[PDB]
DNA sequence: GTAAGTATGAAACGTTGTGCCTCTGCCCCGACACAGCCTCATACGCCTCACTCTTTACACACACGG
DNA sequence: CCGTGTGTGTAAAGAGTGAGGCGTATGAGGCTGTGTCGGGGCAGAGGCACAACGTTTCATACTTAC
């Protein structure tokens, strides 16, 4: 009940962490504090606006070297590419994955899928399959004025 | 003259001396239930802070 | 004659040994090597009315060491050795000490600023760090322990109730080892519901007020 | 007129007395099977690929010696 | 001078680990139901470590006969 609670204020006040990062924490696993969660949403009769890809990315970026234009880039990435409906049905955390990844390859600062998905705790399969559906629309994504190294014209 | 170190000094060792105690305590209601225990979950970080 | 008996003879010989304090780094070299049967020369000069003692490095051992002697009238010193053959002898008895002192002072301290530099290795200081640690609490949807927790759960399962008579046998088989059992101890040696194992127990078996513990169940059920 | 006890003001340990935890059951549950579709998320597993030092083979060479 | 007596290139096995993608399996969730049983903090016994007068003791002057 504590760590529902906690994930719920988390997300109440607009800085929502993931299942995962609760999960880490408590000495519960994830499905124990999803479980708790829908109860205490169900009992307290109130709810919480959805996460968006957004909210994760500020957090994500810190815990990653990841300098703030390159959060930027991963901001904008992430928010375009789920206007375009490019990731349907999927997790906001994944696509905030991909877009990391992305921007970290296209940026001087580059990155792997394993630290990606430890720092967001996505499996890195998850974050293949989230950046397969982004992966043609790679440029139109970025922004406009965006300096970098590695060009986003080839990319792995 | 006990400067700002050693008085600093001084509280610590009583503090973590209960982080240390509640740490067995914490791992001693799981390990006699049967179930290994999680070190980040054992430890009260605000005993210190 | 015994395992224990100490083999006096050095004594009865009256062998006088010398005891000799020296530095770390003059045994350090002698331990580098300690197998080849030569670390140097021990020179001793006497004149009409004083004698002085000296030692000297050998010089494959560095790539002068004066001797001071003391009293030995305070203390009586002997010297015993123990066999590996649990035969305990007595190699003789002191009669002189001295002590090795370094021949430079100035250089010969920064020697020994090494060695406690070297010392102080070990000694473990708090580290600055730049940039907070983020991997405490790295998301992970299941704890390794939660899981295997689980599955342990689920291969054991849950304890099925056995018939009445296998249970009661046991229960009177297990009754000849201990005059008294403890419910939950019970439990495990029968393995059976605690519900289950309790109507059975009642059936036959009755709980005795003990002043020393606690009540416990008696197995006979007279 | 002391003697054998009579009274009196100190210590001193101990037996109920008082707490002080410490279990002991005991209700009070959730989670097991298992039914379809459903979509996304997580885990496993297995063979194909890589590669890398370390030999492994084999045509050829270059003296060597009597 | 044709025997012999040793080197050398370089990809070819020989292991020796190691890695990566993919495809299958799993899960979680809503739901609803039905027998049953451990569980993780719980309302109620149960017996010991202090504990607090207290009952006895012990000289030490005195009480009471004798």
């Given at each position: 009940?504590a760590?529902?609670?906690?994930?719920?204020?988390?997300?109440?006040?607009?800085?929502?962490?993931?299942?995962?990062?609760?999960?880490?924490?408590?000495?519960?696993?994830?499905?124990?504090?999803?479980?708790?969660?829908?109860?205490?949403?169900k009992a307290?009769?109130?709810?919480?606006?959805?996460?968006?890809?957004?909210?994760?990315?500020?957090?994500?970026?810190?815990?990653?070297?990841?300098?703030?234009?390159?959060?930027?880039?991963?901001?904008?990435?992430?928010?375009?590419?789920?206007?375009l409906?490019?990731?349907?049905?999927?997790?906001?955390?994944?696509?905030?994955?991909?877009?990391?990844?992305?921007?970290?390859?296209?940026?001087?600062?580059?990155?792997?899928?394993?630290?990606?998905?430890?720092?967001?705790?996505?499996?890195?399969?998850?974050?293949?399959?989230?950046?397969?559906?982004?992966?043609?629309?790679?440029?139109?994504?970025?922004?406009?004025?965006?300096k970098?190294?590695?060009?986003?014209?080839?990319?792995? | 003259?006990?400067?700002?170190?050693?008085?600093?000094?001084?509280?610590?060792?009583g503090?973590?001396?209960?982080?240390?105690?509640?740490?067995?305590?914490?791992?001693?209601k799981?390990?006699?239930?049967?179930?290994?225990?999680?070190?980040?979950?054992?430890?009260?970080?605000?005993?210190?802070? | 004659?015994?395992?224990?008996?100490?083999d006096?003879?050095?004594?009865?010989?009256?062998?006088?040994?010398?005891?000799?304090?020296?530095?770390?780094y003059?045994?350090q070299?002698?331990?580098?090597?300690?197998?080849?049967?030569?670390?140097?020369?021990?020179?001793i000069?006497?004149?009409?009315g004083?004698?002085?003692?000296?030692?000297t490095?050998?010089?494959?051992?560095?790539?002068?060491?004066?001797?001071?002697?003391?009293?030995?009238?305070?203390?009586?010193?002997?010297?015993?050795?123990?066999?590996?053959?649990?035969?305990?002898?007595?190699?003789?008895?002191?009669?002189?000490?001295?002590?090795?002192?370094?021949?430079a002072?100035?250089?010969?301290?920064?020697?020994?600023?090494?060695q406690?530099?070297?010392?102080?290795?070990?000694?473990?200081?708090?580290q600055?760090?730049?940039?907070?640690?983020?991997?405490?609490?790295?998301?992970?949807?299941?704890?390794?322990?939660?899981?295997?927790?689980?599955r342990?759960?689920?291969?054991?399962?849950?304890?099925?109730?056995?018939?009445?008579?296998?249970?009661?046998?046991?229960?009177?088989?297990?009754?000849?080892?201990?005059?008294?059992?403890?419910?939950?101890?019970?439990?495990?040696?029968?393995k059976?519901?605690v519900?289950?194992?309790?109507?059975?127990?009642?059936?036959?078996?009755?709980?005795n007020?003990?002043?020393?513990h606690?009540?416990?169940?008696?197995?006979?059920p007279?």
């Amino acid at each position: 009940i504590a760590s529902a609670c906690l994930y719920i204020a988390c997300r109440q006040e607009g800085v929502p962490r993931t299942f995962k990062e609760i999960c880490a924490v408590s000495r519960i696993s994830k499905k124990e504090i999803g479980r708790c969660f829908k109860l205490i949403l169900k009992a307290l009769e109130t709810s919480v606006d959805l996460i968006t890809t957004g909210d994760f990315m500020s957090r994500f970026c810190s815990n990653l070297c990841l300098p703030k234009q390159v959060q930027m880039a991963a901001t904008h990435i992430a928010r375009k590419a789920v206007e375009l409906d490019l990731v349907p049905g999927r997790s906001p955390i994944s696509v905030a994955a991909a877009a990391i990844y992305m921007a970290s390859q296209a940026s001087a600062e580059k990155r792997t899928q394993k630290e990606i998905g430890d720092i967001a705790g996505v499996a890195d399969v998850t974050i293949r399959q989230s950046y397969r559906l982004i992966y043609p629309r790679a440029p139109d994504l970025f922004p406009t004025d965006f300096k970098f190294d590695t060009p986003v014209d080839k990319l792995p | 003259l006990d400067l700002a170190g050693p008085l600093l000094a001084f509280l610590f060792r009583g503090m973590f001396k209960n982080l240390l105690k509640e740490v067995r305590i914490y791992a001693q209601k799981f390990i006699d239930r049967g179930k290994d225990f999680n070190l980040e979950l054992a430890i009260k970080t605000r005993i210190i802070s | 004659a015994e395992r224990g008996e100490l083999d006096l003879t050095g004594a009865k010989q009256n062998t006088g040994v010398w005891l000799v304090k020296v530095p770390k780094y003059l045994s350090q070299q002698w331990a580098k090597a300690s197998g080849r049967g030569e670390v140097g020369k021990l020179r001793i000069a006497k004149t009409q009315g004083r004698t002085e003692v000296s030692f000297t490095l050998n010089e494959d051992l560095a790539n002068e060491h004066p001797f001071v002697l003391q009293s030995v009238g305070g203390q009586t010193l002997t010297v015993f050795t123990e066999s590996s053959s649990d035969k305990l002898s007595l190699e003789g008895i002191v009669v002189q000490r001295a002590e090795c002192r370094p021949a430079a002072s100035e250089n010969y301290m920064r020697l020994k600023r090494l060695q406690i530099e070297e010392s102080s290795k070990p000694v473990r200081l708090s580290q600055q760090l730049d940039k907070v640690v983020t991997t405490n609490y790295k998301p992970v949807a299941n704890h390794q322990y939660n899981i295997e927790y689980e599955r342990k759960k689920k291969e054991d399962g849950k304890r099925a109730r056995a018939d009445k008579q296998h249970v009661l046998d046991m229960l009177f088989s297990a009754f000849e080892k201990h005059q008294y059992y403890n419910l939950k101890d019970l439990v495990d040696i029968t393995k059976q519901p605690v519900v289950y194992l309790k109507e059975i127990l009642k059936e036959i078996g009755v709980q005795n007020v003990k002043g020393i513990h606690k009540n416990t169940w008696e197995l006979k059920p007279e």
